[PDB]
Scaffold this active site. Structure first.
Site, PDB file in Angstrom:
ATOM      1  N   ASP A 248       0.843  -1.186   0.000  1.00 51.28           N
ATOM      2  CA  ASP A 248       0.000   0.000   0.000  1.00 51.28           C
ATOM      3  C   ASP A 248       0.884   1.245   0.000  1.00 51.28           C
ATOM      4  OD1 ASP A 248       1.020   0.114   2.529  1.00 51.28           O
ATOM      5  OD2 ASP A 248      -0.902  -0.085   3.568  1.00 51.28           O
TER       6      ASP A 248
HETATM    7  P1  LIG Z   1      -1.307   4.449   3.149  1.00 48.55           P
HETATM    8  O1  LIG Z   1      -2.663   4.199   3.782  1.00 48.55           O
HETATM    9  O2  LIG Z   1      -0.353   3.283   3.316  1.00 48.55           O
HETATM   10  O3  LIG Z   1      -0.653   5.668   3.978  1.00 48.55           O
HETATM   11  C1  LIG Z   1       0.636   6.181   3.550  1.00 48.55           C
HETATM   12  C2  LIG Z   1       1.038   7.335   4.465  1.00 48.55           C
HETATM   13  C3  LIG Z   1      -0.009   8.447   4.362  1.00 48.55           C
HETATM   14  C4  LIG Z   1       1.072   6.836   5.911  1.00 48.55           C
HETATM   15  C5  LIG Z   1       2.416   7.895   4.091  1.00 48.55           C
HETATM   16  O4  LIG Z   1       3.421   6.925   4.343  1.00 48.55           O
HETATM   17  C6  LIG Z   1       2.485   8.336   2.638  1.00 48.55           C
HETATM   18  O5  LIG Z   1       2.484   7.494   1.744  1.00 48.55           O
HETATM   19  N1  LIG Z   1       2.570   9.637   2.402  1.00 48.55           N
HETATM   20  C7  LIG Z   1       2.752  10.190   1.065  1.00 48.55           C
HETATM   21  C8  LIG Z   1       4.035  10.982   0.943  1.00 48.55           C
HETATM   22  C9  LIG Z   1       4.075  12.158   1.893  1.00 48.55           C
HETATM   23  O6  LIG Z   1       3.085  12.479   2.548  1.00 48.55           O
HETATM   24  N2  LIG Z   1       5.235  12.814   1.995  1.00 48.55           N
HETATM   25  C10 LIG Z   1       5.449  13.924   2.913  1.00 48.55           C
HETATM   26  C11 LIG Z   1       6.872  14.423   2.880  1.00 48.55           C
HETATM   27  S1  LIG Z   1       7.169  15.761   4.064  1.00 48.55           S
END
Ligand SMILES: *P(=O)(O)OCC(C)(C)[C@@H](O)C(=O)NCCC(=O)NCCS
Lengths: 50, 49, 72, 134, 50
Positions: free
Chosen positions: C34
Site C-alpha cells: 500500500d
Molecule cells: P497508506 O494508507 O499506506 O498511507 C501512507 C502514508 C499516508 C502513511 C504515508 O506513508 C504516505 O504514503 N505519504 C505520502 C508521501 C508524503 O506524505 N510525503 C510527505 C513528505 S514531508
DNA sequence: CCACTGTTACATTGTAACGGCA
DNA sequence: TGCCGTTACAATGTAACAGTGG
C-alpha cells in the site's frame, strides 16, 4: 551566518539518515513476522486494531 | 531548507560578482582621479608662473 | 549484478522472493504494498544506495522496472 | 525516572538472578544455620512464577549485603532491556590492547570526556585534517 | 481530527465485538432493529429446544 | 588438503563509582 | 540520603579469519 545554517542542515541530514536506518531495519524485521503470521493469526486474532 | 540554502548561496554568489565589478570600476576611477590631480597640480603651477 | 541489490531489497521489503517480482507488474496494486509500504520500499532503496530521491522522481517507481531504471 | 518498571518482568529478573547466585554458591539468605537457609532457598525455588511473593521473599529472607548489588544489577538490566530495542541506542563492546587503552583513557581523563566522546572528537579532527590536506 | 481520533477506539472495539458476535452466528447484523429480531428468533429457538 | 592454534570482534552478565534529583 | 540513569570496566563464550605444519 549562512554557513552555520549549512552545518545545521548537515546535522538534520545525519538525523534523517539515522531515522532511515531505523525504519528500514524495522521493515526488514516486520517482513518475516508478517510472512509467518499470515497463517490466520493476523486475520483477526493478533491485529487487535482497537 | 536545503533548496533554500542552495538558492541563497547562488544569490550570494551573484552579489559577490557584482561587487567585484564595482571594485574594478573603483580601481579604474582611482587611476582617472590620479590623472585629474596631476592635471590640477599642473594648472596651479602654470597659474603661478 | 548490481541489480541484485534492488531485486533483493524489493523482496526483503515486500515479503516476496527474488523471482516473484515481474517487470511488467506494479508495486502499488500488483504486489500488495500500500502507500505506506511503497514509501518504506522507496526509502529503503534510498538508504541502500546512499543517495537521495526527491518526491517527484520517487513517485515514478510504481512499476517494477523503474526501480532499476533510475538506478543504472 | 526514565524507564517504566514492569513487575512481572523485573520480578522474573530478580528470581533468575537469585537462583543464579545460589547456584554459584553465594549465600542468598541471612540465616547462618544451614537448615533455615536451605528451607528458604527451597521456598524460593518452588516460588517460581510469582512476582508478588518473590518480592515478599526478598523482603523477609534476603541477605542484607546483597541488596545493593541486586539493585544495581536490576538497574543495568532494565536500562539494557529498554535500550536494546533500537539500533542507535544499543552499545557495542570491543577489546583494546592495553597500551592503546591506556593512551585513550589518558586522553579521556585529561579532557574530561567519555570514551565515546573522546573518540568522536578525535575522528572528527582526523576528518578535518584530511580536509585540510585535501 | 482530534475529535474523530477520540471517538475512534470506542468505534473500533465496537465494530470488532459486533463482527465477532455476528460471525459466530450465520447471519450478519446491520441494524439495532435487526438485532432485536435476532433476539426474537433466539427466544423462539430457545423455547422450542427446551 | 586437513586439522589444530592464534587472534579480533563482538555478545552477555555483573559490579563499583559518579552524578542528577526528590 | 536513596533511587536511578550512566559509564567503565571484568570474565567468559563464539564466530570468523589467518597462520602453521603434517
Ligand atoms: P497508506 O494508507 O499506506 O498511507 C501512507 C502514508 C499516508 C502513511 C504515508 O506513508 C504516505 O504514503 N505519504 C505520502 C508521501 C508524503 O506524505 N510525503 C510527505 C513528505 S514531508
Amino acid at each position: 551566518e549562512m554557513e552555520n545554517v549549512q552545518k545545521k542542515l548537515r546535522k538534520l541530514e545525519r538525523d534523517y539518515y539515522q531515522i532511515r536506518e531505523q525504519v528500514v531495519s524495522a521493515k526488514a524485521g516486520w517482513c518475516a513476522v508478517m510472512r509467518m503470521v499470515k497463517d490466520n493469526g493476523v486475520e483477526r486474532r493478533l491485529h487487535r486494531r482497537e | 531548507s536545503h533548496k533554500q540554502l542552495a538558492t541563497e548561496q547562488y544569490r550570494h554568489v551573484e552579489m559577490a560578482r557584482e561587487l567585484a565589478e564595482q571594485s574594478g570600476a573603483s580601481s579604474d576611477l582611482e587611476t582617472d582621479h590620479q590623472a585629474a590631480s596631476d592635471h590640477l597640480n599642473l594648472v596651479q603651477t602654470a597659474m603661478r608662473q | 549484478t548490481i541489480e541484485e541489490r534492488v531485486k533483493k531489497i524489493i523482496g526483503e521489503q515486500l515479503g516476496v522472493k527474488q523471482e516473484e517480482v515481474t517487470n511488467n507488474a506494479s508495486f502499488v496494486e500488483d504486489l500488495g504494498a500500500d502507500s505506506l509500504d511503497t514509501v518504506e520500499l522507496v526509502m529503503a532503496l534510498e538508504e541502500e544506495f546512499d543517495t537521495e530521491i526527491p518526491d517527484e522522481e520517487a513517485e515514478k517507481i510504481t512499476t517494477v522496472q523503474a526501480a532499476i531504471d533510475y538506478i543504472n | 525516572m526514565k524507564y517504566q518498571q514492569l513487575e512481572n518482568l523485573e520480578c522474573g529478573w530478580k528470581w533468575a538472578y537469585l537462583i543464579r547466585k545460589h547456584q554459584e554458591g553465594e549465600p542468598i539468605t541471612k540465616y547462618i544455620e544451614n537448615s533455615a537457609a536451605h528451607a528458604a532457598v527451597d521456598k524460593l525455588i518452588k516460588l517460581e512464577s510469582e512476582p508478588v511473593r518473590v518480592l515478599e521473599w526478598i523482603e523477609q529472607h534476603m541477605n542484607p549485603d546483597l541488596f545493593n548489588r541486586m539493585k544495581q544489577t536490576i538497574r543495568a538490566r532494565r536500562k539494557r532491556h529498554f535500550n536494546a530495542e533500537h539500533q542507535h541506542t544499543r552499545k557495542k563492546s570491543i577489546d583494546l590492547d592495553f597500551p592503546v587503552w591506556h593512551r585513550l583513557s589518558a586522553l579521556s581523563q585529561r579532557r574530561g570526556n567519555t570514551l565515546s566522546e573522546t573518540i568522536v572528537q578525535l575522528i572528527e579532527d582526523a576528518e578535518r585534517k584530511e580536509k585540510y590536506a585535501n | 481530527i482530534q475529535s474523530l481520533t477520540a471517538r475512534a477506539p470506542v468505534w473500533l472495539a465496537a465494530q470488532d465485538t459486533l463482527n465477532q458476535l455476528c460471525e459466530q452466528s450465520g447471519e450478519t447484523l446491520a441494524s439495532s432493529n435487526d438485532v432485536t429480531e435476532y433476539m426474537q428468533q433466539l427466544l423462539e429457538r430457545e423455547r422450542e429446544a427446551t
